[PDB]
Symmetry: C2
Subunit: 208 residues, 2 copies
């Protein structure tokens, strides 16, 4: 691993996520948010295709996010620097789990995860300062939930933590009470795998 | 039913304090008094296994925390302690003594798998020491390079941590993979800790 001398003090972060922001701060990366303009439909890039495996999906979506972020940068007229994006999916038996629509949905997702392993996959992509897409990296992790009990899961849902979370849980919150083990990358599970992200940032000559 | 709204955490570690707050548990602290040699509790025994070491030190911390509670005159409530060690090739790696020691530790961990063992113990409000729990994790470091380890030591992040790295900091850059518990590696394994706290009737 040969790290060339850095040329860029600041990275453009094309992410609204507080977790991804926190994880960049954890490795000492300075960043400027570069968020989708009012006229951009950022949600459209995240639609799945049919029969598409989860690893294929998250990679594809991450590449599109990267391309949209770079086009955003060109149109802003702001000075050239690398741009970063990422995407995360939570799956069990190949099925993608989204955010619960209500308490009963949250309960049903958690009872599905309970007593089993599931996979959390995060892809990260960086477009360098000259506009070249670097190879996206995929972080694969598994997460084991205790069987616990229905009442234990109801009690968790009643805290409200499941809402807005893919798979009805957050690893960095109260759900840690049910997580027996993980295998892979805790930062990856949270939405930005730091080993692979650091590597892309050294390649893109970002100082940290 | 939970009976206690709060417990005592007998720990000076910012990481253990943050982790406990993460699961929504309210806590006061029982910190060592200035004239209490808290460091001597962590002395290894000659030829002692890492596993036995962390267990034994955690029971000793629990009993010193019991005496602190008693001395303080504060009300009965549960008491929580934990201890963490890093091990590779059967050897125990503690907190580095200086920058040279931190570099020697990291050089020993580079390109290899090591284990991080954290024991946790709770004394319930009645004064009964519950069975301790042990969280075992493994961590894989990339080879990286001497130079890259030198720069990391330069940041100061190795100091105060067993094995001379902080998983929740810049060291994440050379950690390829973990298996076990990220909170356990940081010093308070939340799965095992939560279970003890439910048994001790702490509200959260």
């Amino acid at each position: 691993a040969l790290f060339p001398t850095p040329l860029f003090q600041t990275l453009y972060l094309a992410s609204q996520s507080p977790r991804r922001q926190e994880l960049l701060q954890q490795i000492g990366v300075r960043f400027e948010l570069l968020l989708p303009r009012p006229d951009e439909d950022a949600e459209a890039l995240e639609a799945e295709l049919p029969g598409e495996a989860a690893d294929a999906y998250v990679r594809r979506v991450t590449v599109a996010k990267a391309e949209a972020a770079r086009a955003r940068l060109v149109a802003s007229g702001k000075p050239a620097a690398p741009v970063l994006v990422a995407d995360t999916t939570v799956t069990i038996d190949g099925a993608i789990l989204g955010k619960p629509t209500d308490a009963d949905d949250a309960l049903a997702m958690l009872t599905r995860l309970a007593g089993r392993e599931h996979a959390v996959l995060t892809a990260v992509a960086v477009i360098d300062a000259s506009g070249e897409l670097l190879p996206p990296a995929l972080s694969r992790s598994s997460v084991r939930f205790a069987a616990a009990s229905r009442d234990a899961y109801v009690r968790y849902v009643e805290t409200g933590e499941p809402f807005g979370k893919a798979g009805a849980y957050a690893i960095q919150g109260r759900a840690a009470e049910f997580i027996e083990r993980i295998d892979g990358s805790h930062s990856g599970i949270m939405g930005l795998p730091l080993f692979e992200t650091a590597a892309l940032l050294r390649t893109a000559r970002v100082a940290f």
